[PDB]
Amino acid sequence: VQRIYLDNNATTRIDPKVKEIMDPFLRDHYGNPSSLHQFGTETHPAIAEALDKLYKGINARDIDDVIITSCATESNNWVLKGVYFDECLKKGKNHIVTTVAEHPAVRSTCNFLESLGVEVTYLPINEHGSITAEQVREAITEKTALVSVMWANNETGLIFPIEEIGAICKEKGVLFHTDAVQAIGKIPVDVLKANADFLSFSAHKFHGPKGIGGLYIRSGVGLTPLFHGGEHMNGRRSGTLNVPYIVGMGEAMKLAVEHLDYEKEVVGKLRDKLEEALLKIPDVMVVGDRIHRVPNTTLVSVRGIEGEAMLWDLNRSNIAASTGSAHTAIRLSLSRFNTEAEIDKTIEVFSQAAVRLRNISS
């Protein structure tokens, strides 16, 4: 049987080099890195190199932290809740600015925060499917503790003006967090250029395992623990380290940046092929802008078919995809593992499935 994975914005496959690098730490290198003996110290080089890859991948500096967490969602809840106690309860800066495009990890936590009495303003989405930096400018008040905008939308795949917002925030003295999970491995990421205080990522979106991610914390910025017990990760996030995954995610990030050119030049080419070969069906449009997008994502609506339906049908022919808010539209999410063969086949099976669904309509 031959299947086609186009659900990469949902999760990706672990690169074999990632699997390989991790295996030893699930076999004999199973010491706890906190221990003082050989079983624990023996794991330090591996860990250190993995971390090196992470720092290097996002151009964090030695004086910054990249804290290992259990996933981006941990990262997000941590920034929001920590800024809550630090900035909102303790310094009275009881406002947060974010967007409506933000992953439920951000919005939902915000929802809880307003439940506690924070006022959060969710920036509305424009015609262009984007946000503009001036848009937060006329929302930052003396009460704003934090602005949080995602680096790229998980649904449409379009990049936001992170540098702009970075500059705004630098200027007006408000903490900046970017949820960058959709950015890693897809477009260059630079916390320095972004003037970010906080950045989130999750490994399984760039060919590492599910169940680990990271939060970048900028030098001398404080953030009260979400995991108290303060021994590991410079006391900012306690719990025995996930050695195998840490080593894997480090390799994963290395490979991701190493394939940044490929991502734009062929995965992007393939994405454009799927897209413009695909819009040759009647009555179909891509949801939002096609310029300021991540190379691997296309979100298409077909006029007179609910997104899900097309998904179920496509599944039957061994091709995986997801939905996305526009009724609902369908999201196709490529990766470095897809072939031209595969998307030719996709154009075929998609058009076929579309026209069949449309005419049994009557």
The tokens describing 301, both together, are 């609506």
At its nearest, how many Å lie between ligand 7TS and the CB of residue 9? 5
99: contact with a second copy by CB under 8 A: no
The reply to whether 126 sits in an annotated binding site is no
Residue 202 touches ligand 7TS, criterion: CB under 6 A: yes
In degrees and rounded to multiples of 5, residue 145 shows phi and psi of -85, -35
> Was 256 annotated as part of a binding site?
no
- Least Å distance between CB 53 and a second copy? 18
Q: Which is nearer to a second copy, 318 or 352 (CB)?
A: 318
Tell me whether residue 184 or residue 270 sits nearer to ligand 7TS (CB atom): 184
Tell me which residue of 102, 100, 120 sits closest to 112, measured CA to CA: 120
Of 299, 302, 341, 344, the residue nearest 322 (C-alpha)? 299
Kindly write out the interface string for residues 232-251 of this chain, putting x where it contacts a second copy by CB under 8 A and - elsewhere: ------xxxxxxxx------
Query: What are φ and ψ of residue 295, in 5° steps?
Result: -55, -20
Q: SS3 helix, strand, coil % of the chain, rounded to 5?
A: 40, 20, 40
Q: 330 with 323: CB under 8 angstroms?
A: yes
The verdict on 282 binding a second copy (CB under 8 A) reads no
- Of 119 and 265, the one with the shorter C-beta distance to a second copy is 119
For the chain, state the CA radius of gyration. Answer: 21
Judge contact between 266 and 124, C-beta under 8 A: no
State which residue, 68 or 181, has the beta carbon closest to ligand 7TS. Answer: 181
Q: Considering the complex, what minimum distance in angstroms separates the CB of residue 132 from ligand 7TS?
A: 20
Whichever of 72 and 113 has its CB closer to ligand 7TS, that residue is 72
Q: Which is nearer to ligand 7TS, 11 or 351 (CB)?
A: 11
CA–CA gap between residue 252 and residue 249 (Å, rounded): 5
175 sits near ligand 7TS (criterion: CB under 6 A): no
* Cα separations in angstroms, 122 against 100, 125, 293, 321: 5, 9, 22, 28
| Residue 36 interface partner, choices ligand 7TS, a second copy, none, CB cut-off 5-8 Å depending on type | a second copy
H/E stretch holding 18 reads helix 16-26
Q: 119-131 in b/e burial notation, b at 16+ Cβ within 10 A?
A: ebbbbebeeebbb
Question: Any known ligand binding at 204?
Answer: yes
d(CA 137, CA 73): 27
Q: Can you read off the two tokens belonging to residue 47?
A: 């860990």
User: What would the x/- binding string for ligand 7TS be over residues 94 to 133, using CB under 6 A?
Assistant: ---------x-x----------------------------
3-state class (DSSP) for residue 9: coil
170 binds, among a second copy, ligand 7TS, none (CB under 5 to 8 A by kind): none
Q: Give the whole-angstrom CA distance, residue 86 versus residue 320.
A: 43
With the CA atoms of 106, 111, 115 and 120 taken in that order, what torsion angle do they form, in degrees rounded to the nearest 10? 80
Near ligand 7TS in 210-239, by CB under 6 A: 213, 239
Interface mask (CB under 8 A) for a second copy, residues 316-345, using x and -? --x-xxx-----------------------
> What distance in Å separates the CA atoms of residue 319 and residue 130, rounded to the nearest whole number?
29
For residue 154, the partner it binds in a second copy, ligand 7TS, none, with Cβ less than 5 to 8 A by kind, is: ligand 7TS
Is residue 240 within the footprint of ligand 7TS (CB under 6 A)? yes
202 known ligand binder = yes
| Residue 237, token pair as written in the block | 């996030």
Binding site for a second copy (CB under 8 A): 3, 5, 7, 10-14, 19, 22, 26-28, 30-32, 34-40, 69-74, 76-77, 103-106, 108-109, 111-112, 202, 204, 209-212, 224-231, 238-245, 308, 311-312, 314-315, 318, 320-322
Return residues touching ligand 7TS (CB under 6 A). 9-10, 32, 34, 71-73, 103, 105, 150, 154, 179, 181-182, 202, 204, 213, 239-240
